[PDB]
């Protein structure tokens, strides 16, 4: 055979990320003394649309804690933020939509976004458009907390992980039908070369395990094992089940 | 300290003081005036330049520059150039149009060297 598209995507040749107009990494602030042990006042200046990402970005202009200059930080906008708002960072930031607090300071039941995972890695969960994590519970004997991620999973995170209270903006975006291959194309230009996506069944055997045959069919079980060598692991990987999801399994 | 970054200190350096010169003999001037001004081109198209525009057309060493051309046109021929134009003619050598300040007369120089 020959190397298969699922294998060709790891090269970087044409499949790299189309990031010429992206506005930079959207993440929190470098955690420091002031924001360990108090609050810092920063002011939003603009809500800028970040290309290739559904969530708006908020330019936040802090004042540098110990040198004399501004700090243009760049957050993932929580639905509610507006220009001119004061967002406060730290542990004694009041629980206001837009402020970022450690989880030691979010009462249980509260919605948060952009959750860090190792204290100071600047936000990894609940970041895409319109997704949030609920702080289910706390454990102060180990200094940890638990959250319900967007996926429906439940992760124990350090109680000093920061989080932006609220939910990410841009929610409800994936409800609108695109209705056009044109819309799909203009969606994927600014993310990466991953569209149009050709059915394997309409390929020749030399480039896809489903390929060939006087009719179009897979010809063998489309569920492949977890360990199958790269180039064989195409189809439905390590599937626990298939068919339309009914009943409890659809939870 | 004051800053959390250690930048490399300032040390002191001495200038090169060889115990033997690397090149003893003094280098002669090789783009001297006689290489730099080969011979005045004497086509009729240039002969017209001699009398219309008060200019002398030389052929100059290909590694010439306008500053050296004016300097050599002064040392030789004991004149000055108010402006030199240069072009590398397609056959390969460089050709220089040396316009004399209108104090000096191109006819006079052309007959002091013999062109016309």
């Amino acid at each position: 055979g020959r190397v298969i598209r699922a294998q060709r995507k790891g090269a970087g040749s044409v499949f790299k990320s189309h990031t010429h107009h992206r506005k930079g990494p959207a993440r929190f602030r470098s955690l420091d003394f002031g924001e360990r042990n108090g609050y810092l006042k920063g002011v939003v200046t603009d809500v800028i649309h970040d290309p290739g990402r559904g969530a708006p970005l908020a330019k936040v202009t802090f004042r540098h804690p110990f040198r004399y200059k501004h700090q243009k930080e760049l957050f993932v906008a929580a639905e509610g933020m507006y220009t001119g708002q004061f967002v406060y960072c730290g542990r004694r930031a009041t629980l206001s939509v837009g402020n970022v607090l450690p989880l030691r300071s979010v009462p249980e039941g509260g919605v948060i976004c952009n959750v860090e995972h190792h204290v100071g890695d600047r936000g990894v969960f609940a970041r895409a458009s319109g997704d949030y994590a609920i702080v289910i519970s706390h454990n102060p004997d180990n200094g940890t907390s638990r959250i319900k991620l967007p996926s429906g999973a439940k992760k124990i995170v350090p109680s000093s992980c920061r989080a932006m209270i609220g939910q990410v903006a841009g929610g409800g975006r994936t409800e609108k039908p695109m209705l056009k291959a044109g819309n799909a194309y203009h969606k994927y230009r600014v993310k990466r070369n991953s569209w149009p996506k050709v059915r394997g069944v309409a390929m020749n055997p030399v480039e896809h395990p489903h390929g060939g045959g006087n009719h179009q069919h897979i010809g063998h079980a489309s569920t492949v094992r977890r360990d199958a060598p790269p180039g064989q692991k195409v189809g439905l990987i390590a599937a626990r089940r298939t068919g339309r999801l009914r009943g409890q399994a659809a939870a | 300290r004051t800053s959390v970054t250690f930048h490399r200190p300032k040390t002191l350096s001495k200038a090169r003081d060889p115990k033997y010169p690397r090149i003893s003999t003094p280098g002669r001037n090789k783009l001297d005036q006689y290489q730099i001004l080969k011979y005045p081109l004497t086509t009729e198209s240039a002969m017209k330049k001699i009398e219309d525009n008060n200019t002398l057309v030389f052929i100059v060493d290909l590694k010439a520059d306008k500053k050296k051309i004016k300097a050599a046109v002064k040392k030789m021929y004991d004149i000055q150039a108010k402006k030199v134009n240069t072009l590398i003619r397609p056959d390969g050598k460089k050709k220089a149009y040396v316009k004399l300040t209108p104090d000096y007369d191109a006819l006079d120089v052309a007959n002091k060297i013999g062109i016309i």
């Binding site: 042990n37 108090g38 006042k41 110990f66 | 959390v4 970054t5 250690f6």
Partner: protein, 229 residues
């Protein structure tokens, strides 16, 4: 006077910008400094075996200074003075033809030579530097002097030994004989040094050193044991 006035800056957590204070704890050093600091830190954490931990037990300052006074009295010969001694015997050979030198008596040094003296038992006092790198060059001189019954001390500073002999290091010294005008001064020091090491080797050959954890780890220790008790 009246205009002169006080302007308090409120160096809070959002107040004015703090001044030029000391941040020496946090300065990101070169990798050379960095590694030579975790070097000694890791030698602290790890459990030194007794053979290496017989060091870190040095001569005390007072007896060290008393000893080094005598060592300075018996310094080896200068380059400046070693030309004169060979220059001025020229005449004693040329005219008298007879040598009138008596034995010049000075300290001995150098690891091979001192092991030679020690192993013949001509070494009347041994002084080993604690900080020889690689350590294996003197891991065994304490035991050698101990099992051949020669008084030894593990002094501090191989460079300070080197100064005695005019070298950049010395790493070992030993005395074989002293002037008759200072036997008593000598033998006052030998008994003390013997008492410190040639009396304690047979119980410090068993003690593991090291293991002294960090400051924050010891604070953890005292925090933890209280809440246990």
């Amino acid at each position: 006077n009246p205009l002169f006035e006080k302007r308090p800056k409120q160096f809070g957590i959002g107040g004015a910008l703090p001044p030029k204070k000391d941040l020496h704890r946090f300065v990101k050093w070169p990798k050379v400094v960095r590694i030579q600091r975790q070097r000694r830190i890791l030698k602290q954490r790890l459990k030194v075996p007794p053979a290496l931990h017989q060091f870190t037990r040095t001569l005390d300052k007072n007896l060290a200074t008393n000893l080094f006074k005598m060592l300075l009295k018996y310094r080896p010969e200068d380059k400046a003075a070693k030309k004169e001694r060979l220059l001025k015997r020229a005449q004693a050979e040329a005219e008298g033809k007879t040598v009138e030198a008596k034995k010049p008596i000075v300290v001995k040094y150098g690891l091979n030579h001192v092991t030679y003296l020690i192993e013949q038992s001509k070494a009347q006092l041994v002084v080993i530097a604690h900080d020889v790198d690689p350590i294996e060059l003197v891991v065994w001189l304490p035991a050698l002097c101990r099992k051949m019954e020669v008084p030894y001390c593990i002094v501090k500073g191989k460079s300070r030994l080197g100064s005695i002999v005019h070298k950049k290091t010395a790493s070992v010294l030993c005395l074989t004989t002293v002037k008759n005008e200072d036997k008593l001064e000598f033998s006052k020091i030998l008994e003390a040094i013997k008492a410190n090491f040639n009396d304690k080797f047979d119980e410090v050959r068993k003690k593991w050193g090291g293991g002294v954890m960090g400051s924050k780890s010891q604070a953890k220790t005292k925090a933890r044991e209280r809440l246990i008790a």
